[PDB]
Amino acid sequence: DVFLMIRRHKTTIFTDAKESSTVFELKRIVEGILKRPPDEQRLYKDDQLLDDGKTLGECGFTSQTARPQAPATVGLAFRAFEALCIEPFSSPP
Amino acid sequence: YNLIHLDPRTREGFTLLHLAVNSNTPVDDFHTNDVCSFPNALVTKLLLDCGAEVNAVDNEGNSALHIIVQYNRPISDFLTLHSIIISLVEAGAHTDMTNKQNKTPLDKSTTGVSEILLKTQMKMSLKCLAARAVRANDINYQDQIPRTLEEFVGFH
Amino acid sequence: TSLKPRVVDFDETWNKLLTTIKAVVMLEYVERATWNDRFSDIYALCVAYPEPLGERLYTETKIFLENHVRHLHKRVLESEEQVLVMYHRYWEEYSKGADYMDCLYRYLNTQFIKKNPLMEIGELALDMWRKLMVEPLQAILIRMLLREIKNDRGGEDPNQKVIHGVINSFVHVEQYKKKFPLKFYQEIFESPFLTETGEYYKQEASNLLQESNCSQYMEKVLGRLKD
Amino acid sequence: MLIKVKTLTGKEIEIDIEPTDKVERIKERVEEKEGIPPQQQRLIYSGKQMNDEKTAADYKILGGSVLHLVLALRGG
Amino acid sequence: MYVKLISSDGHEFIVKREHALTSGTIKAMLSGPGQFAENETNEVNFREIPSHVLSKVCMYFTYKVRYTNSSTEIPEFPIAPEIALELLMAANFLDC
Numbered sequence: 001d002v003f004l005m006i007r008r009h010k011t012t013i014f015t016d017a018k019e020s021s022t023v024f025e026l027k028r029i030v031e032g033i034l035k036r037p038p039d040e041q042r043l044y045k046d047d048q049l050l051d052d053g054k055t056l057g058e059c060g061f062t063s064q065t066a067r068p069q070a071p072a073t074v075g076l077a078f079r080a081f082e083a084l085c086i087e088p089f090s091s092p093p
Numbered sequence: 094y095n096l097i098h099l100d101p102r103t104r105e106g107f108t109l110l111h112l113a114v115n116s117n118t119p120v121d122d123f124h125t126n127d128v129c130s131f132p133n134a135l136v137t138k139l140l141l142d143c144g145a146e147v148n149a150v151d152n153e154g155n156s157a158l159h160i161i162v163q164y165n166r167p168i169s170d171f172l173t174l175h176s177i178i179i180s181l182v183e184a185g186a187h188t189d190m191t192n193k194q195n196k197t198p199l200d201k202s203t204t205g206v207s208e209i210l211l212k213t214q215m216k217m218s219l220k221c222l223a224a225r226a227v228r229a230n231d232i233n234y235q236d237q238i239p240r241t242l243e244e245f246v247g248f249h
Numbered sequence: 250t251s252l253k254p255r256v257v258d259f260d261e262t263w264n265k266l267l268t269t270i271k272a273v274v275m276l277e278y279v280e281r282a283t284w285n286d287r288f289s290d291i292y293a294l295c296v297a298y299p300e301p302l303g304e305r306l307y308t309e310t311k312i313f314l315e316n317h318v319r320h321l322h323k324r325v326l327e328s329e330e331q332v333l334v335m336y337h338r339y340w341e342e343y344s345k346g347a348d349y350m351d352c353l354y355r356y357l358n359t360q361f362i363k364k365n366p367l368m369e370i371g372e373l374a375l376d377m378w379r380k381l382m383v384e385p386l387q388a389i390l391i392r393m394l395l396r397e398i399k400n401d402r403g404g405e406d407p408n409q410k411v412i413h414g415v416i417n418s419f420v421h422v423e424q425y426k427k428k429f430p431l432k433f434y435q436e437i438f439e440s441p442f443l444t445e446t447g448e449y450y451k452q453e454a455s456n457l458l459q460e461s462n463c464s465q466y467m468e469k470v471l472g473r474l475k476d
Numbered sequence: 477m478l479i480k481v482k483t484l485t486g487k488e489i490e491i492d493i494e495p496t497d498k499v500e501r502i503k504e505r506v507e508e509k510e511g512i513p514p515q516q517q518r519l520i521y522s523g524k525q526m527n528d529e530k531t532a533a534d535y536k537i538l539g540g541s542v543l544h545l546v547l548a549l550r551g552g
Numbered sequence: 553m554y555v556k557l558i559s560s561d562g563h564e565f566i567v568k569r570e571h572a573l574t575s576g577t578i579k580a581m582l583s584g585p586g587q588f589a590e591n592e593t594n595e596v597n598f599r600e601i602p603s604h605v606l607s608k609v610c611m612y613f614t615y616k617v618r619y620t621n622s623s624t625e626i627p628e629f630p631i632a633p634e635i636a637l638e639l640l641m642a643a644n645f646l647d648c
Contacts, residue, residue: 003614011564014571014610016618033554033566033592068614069629089604090561092634168522171544172484205523206544213518213548217619217626218648219612223640226631234637239254239296241360242644250560251600252641273585284584285597288577292645352580359576359647518623527623550621
């Protein structure tokens with residue numbers, strides 16, 4: 001129901017999910033494509049933290065904002081807790 | 094094929110396809126109008142299997158797709174409006190190409206049946222959206238974009 | 250950088266594109282980064298300012314493919330006894346070579362070839378394989394294709410893969426002709442093999458008319474049909 | 477109410493749907509006789525295509541009429 | 553599977569393969585030499601196209617996968633007028 005981009009630092013994984021689906025599904029999905037244990041990354045919304053229990057559609061990631069033509073930027077930071085390091089895109093002309 | 098490659102164009106810019114998809118093309122009353130009916134989907138089909146330039150522009154900038162959606166008889170002969178449109182957009186008739194007066198063929202619908210047929214046959218492409226966004230804001234593109242892309246910008 | 254058209258000289262970039270496309274049509278090893286940069290090269294040369302030189306690149310690809318298929322022809326002619334084992338070895342490495350060259354030249358086939366009479370590279374590489382590797386080397390191919398299948402008919406079990414590759418190298422070459430896609434195979438291998446089969450079964454039936462009576466003739470003809 | 481919707485060759489489709497029947501499944505019954513699956517017969521209600529429930533009173537609640545349908549595939 | 557897209561200056565992207573094959577020169581870059589025995593990343597190195605335009609074309613991949621042959625209103629793709637010119641060049645290079 002929602003479309004989000006998992007933007008960790010350099011990479012930005014584009015994925016679809018559901019309102020009823022939870023954070024654990026997100027972490028399971030990003031495990032097989034980034035090879036990171038779930039406790040080594042903490043997700044975000046702007047700067048607000050999230051946990052592994054609340055649903056994806058709960059913490060402001062609704063179908064009216066995580067639409068695919070402008071997905072909601074969910075931030076990630078990986079453990080070696082490190083800060084949420086996200087660098088912006090290139091300069092538009 | 095020979096005639097098409099000799100590019101037959103009337104004074105209005107109409108090619109063979111433009112007249113073959115136009116109901117306004119006069120058909121001879123002397124023993125002929127009872128047989129030859131315009132627009133006809135068969136002739137258009139036979140004009141696309143022979144390789145007519147389907148994205149041709151007339152004096153008004155209308156393509157064959159612009160002309161066919163101007164048809165005002167979607168009930169009397171629906172198939173001759175349907176079986177031609179699928180015949181028109183099958184060789185690369187750019188559904189979003191825009192005439193000289195800045196009218197998309199969706200804009201020149203004048204018919205719910207024709208516009209819904211175009212919408213069903215329309216396939217989206219980021220090329221089309223990006224070109225439309227470029228022209229809707231009038232960014233200078235000449236001598237900055239590919240040479241083949243200037244014509245595509247002029248299409249939208 | 251970027252996708253903006255730039256004045257690029259054709260010489261060293263075309264040589265550096267040859268460095269990869271020669272290995273592509275031989276099914277050799279090319280790096281993924283190299284193969285993904287040749288796409289950018291082909292795009293840059295396809296819209297290069299101030300003259301879009303896709304025509305020069307198209308003609309140079311014509312020249313390279315013609316020379317390469319003629320080299321394959323001269324090499325296959327040397328192995329006169331085993332040309333089938335050499336033709337099919339140089340066709341499995343050129344059919345996929347033609348397909349990969351078509352993939353590499355994807356932007357050319359949708360900007361300069363189909364939009365301006367001209368043949369797309371996946372159709373040109375195959376059309377350079379019948380015009381320069383099958384049409385001139387036709388009788389040698391066909392007569393011994395019939396000879397190998399006749400040896401299979403009598404008692405032998407020749408290389409099924411080689412024959413089944415050379416034979417479909419007549420329907421595969423004409424895969425890009427929308428009108429009569431089998432026409433080359435319908436006049437290079439269909440009719441000659443049909444007439445040779447007719448002669449061979451005529452003499453086979455004549456031989457089995459006198460060898461056995463009408464009872465065993467039924468079982469023998471049924472077995473020969475099943476075979 | 478039986479329908480007389482035209483087709484790609486001047487045929488007929490029997491919707492057998494009353495004016496209060498929604499066109500969400502009314503087109504399915506019409507296409508059941510013709511053969512098309514429910515979510516593929518993009519019928520045109522003399523100027524527009526029915527969407528979602530689309531109770532037949534929207535299309536003038538006509539009896540029988542002639543609804544030229546589109547053969548739009550991949551809509552399932 | 554999931555495919556991987558380099559940008560001009562870092563800015564890694566990862567899009568589902570069925571989503572990134574809607575373009576034209578990804579289906580060609582992914583049909584090249586090599587059997588792709590790994591089948592997990594098969595990264596493509598877009599050396600020339602910048603990062604923001606690559607993000608927008610990935611968003612377009614998701615958009616076109618979601619809204620293909622739909623009976624809805626097909627909500628408009630938002631194009632920044634600054635990114636409009638470069639995205640046009642990308643959608644020229646990235647066929648469709």
